Amino acid sequence: NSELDRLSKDDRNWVMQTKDYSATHFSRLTEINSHNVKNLKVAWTLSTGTLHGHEGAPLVVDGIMYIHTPFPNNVYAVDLNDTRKMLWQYKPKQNPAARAVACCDVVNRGLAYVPAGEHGPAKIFLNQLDGHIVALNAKTGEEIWKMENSDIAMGSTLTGAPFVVKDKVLVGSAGAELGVRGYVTAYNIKDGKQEWRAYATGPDEDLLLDKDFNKDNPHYGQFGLGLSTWEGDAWKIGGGTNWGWYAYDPKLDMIYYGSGNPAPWNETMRPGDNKWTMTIWGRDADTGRAKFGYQKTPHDEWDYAGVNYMGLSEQEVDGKLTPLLTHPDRNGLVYTLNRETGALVNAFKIDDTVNWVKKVDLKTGLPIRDPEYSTRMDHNAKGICPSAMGYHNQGIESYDPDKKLFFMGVNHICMDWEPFMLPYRAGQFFVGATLNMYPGPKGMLGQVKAMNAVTGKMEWEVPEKFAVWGGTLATAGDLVFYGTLDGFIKARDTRTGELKWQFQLPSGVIGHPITYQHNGKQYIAIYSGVGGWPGVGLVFDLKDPTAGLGAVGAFRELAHYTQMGGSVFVFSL
């Protein structure tokens, strides 16, 4: 959507969760910098009126902030000239049973927006937990249309944010822990009419492939693999949901995103490479046809769900300027690909302690597995790095084009893992593994790192008490902002990683900060309201260290620092 793209270049706006189509999460605003950020103070705050995990972040379009909420996913609009008053609201009626088929808290990653409009007036888009994609009037809050995407009876929900491209809105999927077979769907913004729908497993027509699929990298594999990498009809419940983020290149007219983990977690119950789970996709916008697809983790054994964000950039590869995508996976590897051909440019460990793979052979594209850290029936694998939470999760990260550095919030969590046999029944959980999680070899749970994605050169690395979950925001003031699970927002110098400012929020942060300028002054905003997977112990009052899919034990001390909350904080000089 060219008009949406143009709107994102206005520093008054923050028009999508990823800030822009390249998902840079970078602002050129320099009013707030390393030199004065010590003087940063709270300007105003809003309560969301709910608890549990608050992921994503507000949108700002036309001097109007848009706020979303975990289940039941309430939506509020605020006039930035009257921050106390609620301009409009939308309060969904959803079957509360939806709560029961969410693996890792009832989080929701936020609103999308499209301007007017041959389709016509500007619209806010919301994915509800109960599986609906809803279109609202951006100005009035009136419900324009509402469609069924996912069925909670099948254990299928929505948590990932909708994504606007041209006159279409893409809706992902969730529930691989309940054996949901992944699929992404494009709806016409005017009608709600389904245009195309691509699955992550099965026959080639369901995958929605182009005739030239992976013609530039035929060793990635091409046709029939959605079937032939499974035994029998195993693919019908074979995971590959996509509940993460998208990227878009208008010149190439291509959408980028990753598909999730195979089902179940019990690898012995699904022999084969399990394509096309764990795959980096490059699909044509209008038809949804995949031009390339690269499987990062063939035959997943660790729940390294390949859904993390897609950061586009243009950098030199052997002296040649190249359109790229950079993508830090759960498996602990940072992938950089040519976003035109899908060619592997680099794949390096985000942290050297990653041990499920020795290295990725860039020529064959294959990750060389270390059998010592595999998983299998009748065995309890110990000391696997990363754990199922990964060395990186759902946080959107940031890119400074002048430094050519990606700034990321990192997890340092490892695990024990043993599978067990289980049946599949539509509507029931279909995990099939018992986990125990704990800090990685360096003793800490969190890190923040700055890196060149082409070389893998770490410019700096710092520790954090807990995993940095919510992503980052970088600015031309030489600062990177992020929230922590124990309830801080922090600013570090992007050259050195030095801490330059921090404020104690009410609750932990699992979303990203945003920035915008309103009436000539720069602002920083963030959600405070801990939850998500690291907070399942705290949120649902769990005791057993292997509960919450193994997360409870790892994050036992989190509740020593933070309760649940739900608020929007806004800072300024």
Partner: protein, 72 residues
């Protein structure tokens, strides 16, 4: 199983030492009910049918209605 030995492009899976090539009829036969496997796709067709009913109604009348039993 190091992931390197590929029977075809994109297909490099091998069983681990001591594990079967096919799980059917083995120690680890998942033994899935075909009727349960097919419920996801059956549910999606139902949704796409209700969805198309909502679209065509929105197109003809110009006023959106979610409840399909309220659609002519």
């Amino acid at each position: 199983y190091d992931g390197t030995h590929c029977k075809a492009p994109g297909n490099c899976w091998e069983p681990k030492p001591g594990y079967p090539d096919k799980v059917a009829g083995s120690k680890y036969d998942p033994k899935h009910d075909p009727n349960e496997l097919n419920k996801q796709a059956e549910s999606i067709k139902a949704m796409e049918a209700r969805n198309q009913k909502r679209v065509e109604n929105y197109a003809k009348t110009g006023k959106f209605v979610y409840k399909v039993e309220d659609i002519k």
